[PDB]
Amino acid sequence: MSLCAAISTSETTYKNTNFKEYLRHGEEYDLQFIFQLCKITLTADVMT
Amino acid sequence: VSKVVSTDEYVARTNIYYHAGTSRLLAVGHPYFPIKKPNNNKILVPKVSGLQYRVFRIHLPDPNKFGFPDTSFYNPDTQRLVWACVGVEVGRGQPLGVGISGHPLLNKLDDTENASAYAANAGVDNRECISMDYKQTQLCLIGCKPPIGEHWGKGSPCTNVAVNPGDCPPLELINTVIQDGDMVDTGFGAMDFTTLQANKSEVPLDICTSICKYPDYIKMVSEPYGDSLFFYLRREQMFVRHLFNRAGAVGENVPDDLYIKGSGSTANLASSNYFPTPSGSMVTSDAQIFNKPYWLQRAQGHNNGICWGNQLFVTVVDTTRSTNMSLCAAISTSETTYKNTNFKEYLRHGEEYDLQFIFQLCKITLTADVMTYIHSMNSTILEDWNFGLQPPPGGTLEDTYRFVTSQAIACQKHTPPAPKEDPLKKYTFWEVNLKEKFSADLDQFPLGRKFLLQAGLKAKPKF
Amino acid sequence: ATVYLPPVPVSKVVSTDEYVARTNIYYHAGTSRLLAVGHPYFPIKKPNNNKILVPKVSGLQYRVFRIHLPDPNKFGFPDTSFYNPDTQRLVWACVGVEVGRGQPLGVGISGHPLLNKLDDTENASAYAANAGVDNRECISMDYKQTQLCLIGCKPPIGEHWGKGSPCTNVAVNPGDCPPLELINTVIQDGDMVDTGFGAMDFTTLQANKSEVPLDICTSICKYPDYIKMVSEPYGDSLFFYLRREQMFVRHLFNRAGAVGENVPDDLYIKGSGSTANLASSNYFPTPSGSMVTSDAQIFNKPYWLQRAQGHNNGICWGNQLFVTVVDTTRSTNMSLCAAISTSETTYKNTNFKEYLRHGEEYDLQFIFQLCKITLTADVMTYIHSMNSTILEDWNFGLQPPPGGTLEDTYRFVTSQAIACQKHTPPAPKEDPLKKYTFWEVNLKEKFSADLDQFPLGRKFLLQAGLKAKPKF
Amino acid sequence: TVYLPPVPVSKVVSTDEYVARTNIYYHAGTSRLLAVGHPYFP
């Protein structure tokens, strides 16, 4: 999206010198994560 | 108990189905701006184009008032009736063709697609007359609470640095209810150009003043009851066309270390800002999401097609029919040598929808948990019903009569204040009344018999 | 008061498959073929005369097809015994339909030699000039590709925009905005598809006459309204259809002429110098047809009509059946040239006249199924309710006069050279729609009792199986 | 109704009626074909 601001709001004759130009950008994320539960049975080989 | 439940729990489905629908719709206006008498503030013509959003508020009469051929199957004391919306249709009659928009003064530097030489120096008011097509879009929105949109906007900056004229205003994410007449995104994102664009020439006319908005599916679907929307469909597409520059004083210079200092013509940095030209693509008869039945059985929300307060919403937007017919009238019919001075030019623009709604009938048994749970959900609902009471006061009153007789008893009658019913009355938007149009037969209608066809069980008299 | 409901007026129009019965017999008939020629842009006529030298013909023009059938109740069956001609009748049901097209597929085109235009708005390196006098130009474009088909026993109903009578408050000054109304009408042959300029009359609402290419300028482009069509109680307008169309943008222009309504200034910032004058605000798109394909063709393929959205199921009342077909695929305009002088070997543009002729290639083949009607009270009423004229070609006959009678017409013998009035023996006219001119075909002779001999029919076999009709 | 009442026994028939299919199959084919020339005029 491009926007512009006016350094001088008075004159009604348009002048390119009157506006500074800026560029800003949006970002939108969301996360929803299912999860299942797990247990580990445990011995030597396991550990190793 | 907390934690909202699937409305199909307590609701029970009846055996009866009804249909009603408007005859039709046909709308005409001017796409670019509304027309008004020049000195007057009253509108001569309303601004209309396909680009404008469309909202539809649809009332139903209270079924508990609606006598059935046999009303015996329920008790009006312990129970109520509330309408369920099984299936929905949207008619469109216009021949499919694409409109267009532009602006006579458009901020532009030059063409950046191909440049054989470095450009010239920015003059004063280089804006030009140029037009472009908006992104194609189709969507449909259905539910018992108003569709919730969102847009960018200017917020209150932190007060630390003093803002000089021309500084970058901070940005903010702002929800609001969606109002009719509002504009689809052009690919320039949902925001208020009026506030954040002082140039006013940075976009074509149609969207310049308004605030383009866009539906936020998350927050919408995030509602616990889903009553914002229980259903929708969407299609859109876009591709790039042209590549331009903003023309004006540079707000923020590029760090030099990102390039190598030039000289002569290359000493001055050309405008850094680029903006795309969005382009609609080839439309087709296949991707049309209208003129085809829908069947709503299960939705994402626990609300299943329940319309509370006899109220149901439809939000529909399409650019496919945006066609702008041009016409011309002659100020003088005499001369046979044509002169451009002889003809005034005007722009009028058509719109056509149609609405046909199935409905299923539903009864609610009560208990305290019931009564509370609803009252918890929205208590205004019970108001339109007859349950909640509410003992009144009022021992004595002194009438003194009569007052115009000017022996002064006091000055008195102050209580209008509650015809007020719609809290959203502040929100103006499109309106329709179906209340008269119900009928008890799906056979006589074009749409209905499909309902039978889908679920079977054709039942008709003999001849 | 208003809506608290113990009403029941209506007796419920019902699905025609209730009372109609289906027989065991099937037939076919079809034309050899059809085609036609004409000039795409305008019809040709002797310059002084009013009579047409060449009819205006192009694919862009709509096509209507009216198809008569002979009364099956006058029709001998190999065995007629299965019914009684007294208590019953016979009416044709239309099972399946075909549309032949043999042309090689190619796209035509149209334009206008004087086209209202300012300049190109897609790219401008500088502000435009000031509007002169008569800037119109010779420019052309291609129309939107379209394919559709319409079938039913009542004429296809179209619609268009149009100018109506002003609400009389403000007096109209010359050049005031002529305003808009929606108008239904019957669809006539020779009428034009939308170009993407919308269904309306340019003649009335466009005084410039130059705002569109020739072909549509005088005519009124119309478009079929499915809603108002389909929602008919009987469906008898159309019990079926198919549609395809597509379009995309190409060019972006300006209308050139006196601005009718100025834009509110607050919608922009006032310029100066060259930027003092606002350029023409009106833009109009250039519609552009896309790539045609052999795949999306809706023709040369059979159809099967069993269930329709209307209660009418393929029933043709009054031995009458309608087909409306429109396509832009075959619009190809072949150009030719002739030499006024064959002698000189140095090519000279003055030596050749140029002409444009165009082909339109149609074919029709129809299945038919045979159906009988038993008569009772409710029967008679229900039809008499539906359309009483439908009965008319049956043997009412008459109804009889539970309609009244003529009270003894006056036949009074005079040479006419008495002073006594004119008397002219009356009553040919059988068509209420006779006002509406459109294409005509007669099948009445062409029925045959065996599908085996035809290309189309045996598909009817193949799909329904059982190949030899008298076997399992 | 004019042309239908008369009818003789007529009927072109489906060639699978009288023809009989056998149990034998064969193959043959050209090696390949190749042609050369000028696209515009001879």
Curated annotation (Swiss-Prot), chain A:
Q: Where in the cell is it found?
A: Virion; Host nucleus
* Highest taxon in the source lineage: Viruses
PTM per UniProt? ISGylated by host HERC5, this results in dominant-negative effect on virus infectivity.
As a miscellaneous remark, the entry gives: HPV16, in comparison to HPV types 6 and 11, is more often associated with malignant genital cancers in humans.
Q: Which family does it belong to?
A: Belongs to the papillomaviridae L1 protein family.
Function of the protein: Forms an icosahedral capsid with a T=7 symmetry and a 50 nm diameter. The capsid is composed of 72 pentamers linked to each other by disulfide bonds and associated with L2 proteins. Binds to heparan sulfate proteoglycans on cell surface of basal layer keratinocytes to provide initial virion attachment. This binding mediates a conformational change in the virus capsid that facilitates efficient infection. The virion enters the host cell via endocytosis. During virus trafficking, L1 protein dissociates from the viral DNA and the genomic DNA is released to the host nucleus.
Its subunit composition reads: Self-assembles into homopentamers. The capsid has an icosahedral symmetry and consists of 72 capsomers, with each capsomer being a pentamer of L1. Interacts with the minor capsid protein L2; this interaction is necessary for viral genome encapsidation. Interacts with protein E2; this interaction enhances E2-dependent replication and transcription activation. Interacts with host KPNA2; this interaction mediates the nuclear localization of L1 capsomers. Interacts with host ITGA6. Interacts with host SDC1; this interaction promotes efficient infection of keratinocytes.
Q: What is this protein called?
A: Major capsid protein L1
What species does this protein belong to? Human papillomavirus type 16
From Swiss-Prot, chain C:
GO annotations under biological process? endocytosis involved in viral entry into host cell; virion attachment to host cell
GO terms for cellular component: host cell nucleus; T=7 icosahedral viral capsid
Pfam families found in the cross-reference section: Late_protein_L1
Chief subcellular location equals virion
* Post-translational modification comment from the UniProt entry: ISGylated by host HERC5, this results in dominant-negative effect on virus infectivity.
Q: Which UniProt keywords apply?
A: Capsid protein, Disulfide bond, Host nucleus, Host-virus interaction, Late protein, T=7 icosahedral capsid protein, Ubl conjugation, Viral attachment to host cell, Viral penetration into host cytoplasm, Virion, Virus endocytosis by host, Virus entry into host cell
Q: Domain of life of the organism in this record?
A: Viruses
Q: Which Gene Ontology molecular function entries are recorded, alphabetically?
A: structural molecule activity
Q: Known SUPFAM superfamilies for this protein?
A: Group I dsDNA viruses
Other observations noted:
HPV16, in comparison to HPV types 6 and 11, is more often associated with malignant genital cancers in humans.
Q: Which family does it belong to?
A: Belongs to the papillomaviridae L1 protein family.
Q: How does it assemble?
A: Self-assembles into homopentamers. The capsid has an icosahedral symmetry and consists of 72 capsomers, with each capsomer being a pentamer of L1. Interacts with the minor capsid protein L2; this interaction is necessary for viral genome encapsidation. Interacts with protein E2; this interaction enhances E2-dependent replication and transcription activation. Interacts with host KPNA2; this interaction mediates the nuclear localization of L1 capsomers. Interacts with host ITGA6. Interacts with host SDC1; this interaction promotes efficient infection of keratinocytes.
What's the stated role of this polypeptide? Forms an icosahedral capsid with a T=7 symmetry and a 50 nm diameter. The capsid is composed of 72 pentamers linked to each other by disulfide bonds and associated with L2 proteins. Binds to heparan sulfate proteoglycans on cell surface of basal layer keratinocytes to provide initial virion attachment. This binding mediates a conformational change in the virus capsid that facilitates efficient infection. The virion enters the host cell via endocytosis. During virus trafficking, L1 protein dissociates from the viral DNA and the genomic DNA is released to the host nucleus.
What protein name applies here?
A: Major capsid protein L1
Report the gene name.
L1
